[PDB]
């Protein structure tokens, strides 16, 4: 039957004490296969299943610096959402990102994903067509307006139609 | 590989 890949990136604010904790966890189908935690002494990146060991040191090193960059996106964007929602800087907040792809045996793509949740509420989501966006409230409307104008959907579509699927079968070809 | 650097909110 069908198969899927899913990445859950999560960032949470901490009272006073410096930068937000960063979490990134990868799922193949619904099984966890890869994980990144900023709280770890040497944060890096790591394998969560045995069959992901056969990956080269280049794969892990590159994928780690990608997550190191992702932390900056969250630091910045947590800050902008405080502006949109008129919230105080002395508070703590959660911003989660989910992306990935669905395929079921046609070695083709069924569905793409690029969506965001803020403090456990839906913010913005890429629609099934990967052209339009669902915005939950007024703050998300601002994002939706400029993502439609700039062509963010097309930006994300280059990954979801290409690399997302390719790497999924690359991963599926294991175990 | 991971998705490209996401757009700004």
């Amino acid at each position, epitope marked *: 039957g069908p198969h899927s890949m899913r990445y859950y990136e999560t960032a949470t604010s901490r009272r006073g004490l410096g930068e937000p904790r960063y979490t990134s966890v990868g799922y193949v189908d619904d099984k966890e296969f890869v994980r990144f935690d900023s709280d770890a002494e040497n944060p890096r990146y790591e394998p969560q299943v045995p069959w992901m060991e056969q990956e080269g040191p280049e794969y892990w090193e590159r994928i780690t610096q990608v997550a190191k960059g992702q932390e*900056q996106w969250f*630091r*910045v964007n947590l*800050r*902008t959402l405080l502006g949109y929602y008129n919230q105080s800087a002395g508070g703590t907040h959660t911003l989660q990102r989910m992306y990935g792809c669905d395929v079921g045996s046609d070695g083709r793509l069924l569905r793409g994903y690029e969506q965001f949740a803020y403090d456990g509420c839906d913010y913005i989501a890429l629609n099934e067509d990967l052209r339009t966006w669902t915005a939950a409230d007024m703050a998300a409307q601002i994002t939706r307006r*400029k993502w439609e104008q*700039a*062509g*963010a959907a*097309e*930006y994300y*579509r*280059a990954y979801l*139609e290409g690399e997302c699927v390719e790497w999924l079968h690359r991963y599926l070809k294991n175990g | 590989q991971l998705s*490209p*650097f996401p*757009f*700004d909110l």
Partner: single-chain antibody
Amino acid sequence: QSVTQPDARVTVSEGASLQLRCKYSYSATPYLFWYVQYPRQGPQMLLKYYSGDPVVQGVNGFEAEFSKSDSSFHLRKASVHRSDSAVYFCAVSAKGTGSKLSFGKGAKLTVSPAAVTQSPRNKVTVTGENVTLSCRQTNSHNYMYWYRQDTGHELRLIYYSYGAGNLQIGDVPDGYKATRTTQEDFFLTLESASPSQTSLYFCASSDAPGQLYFGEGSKLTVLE
């Protein structure tokens, strides 16, 4: 990596059709842009390509077609006015570094019969002087850039920044310091001005990978 524009100089009669060529050699198919630069102004984006429809519509009546097999992104316009006389830059963004915009050599077109504010429009000093170029933008963009353009050539990236306090090196950073003190402000500093640092400096801000809004330019001459 690289982008290639075959002809530095192009002359077409007014009312005629234009095609400006661009070819890229990249390991992965990059993000593709065309920019226009009218005399005494910063570059302005014409159109952009990420994916999907290989034919994209630009501003001022331009359109471009992407071709994977040909590795090309040629620009074209049905009927050229006199006001189209400018320098046209094919530009590219690497897949892993979407916000770092790199320019082609440029094509000067002769057709014959951006809330980014930068503080010093013109400046002349001598060797050894401290020079600071200011740049402020009220667009709420998180990306800011400092480029330099030697007259006759393309914009070359010095430094860029993503959010306050961030600093990322460009292609030609030697001799420069930069500081992103706030979201809106990005200073460029020449601690000891050298005669090799005489050129046209452009600040820019961005909201979306490779889509830049340029200031009006700070022309600096440093004399020995």
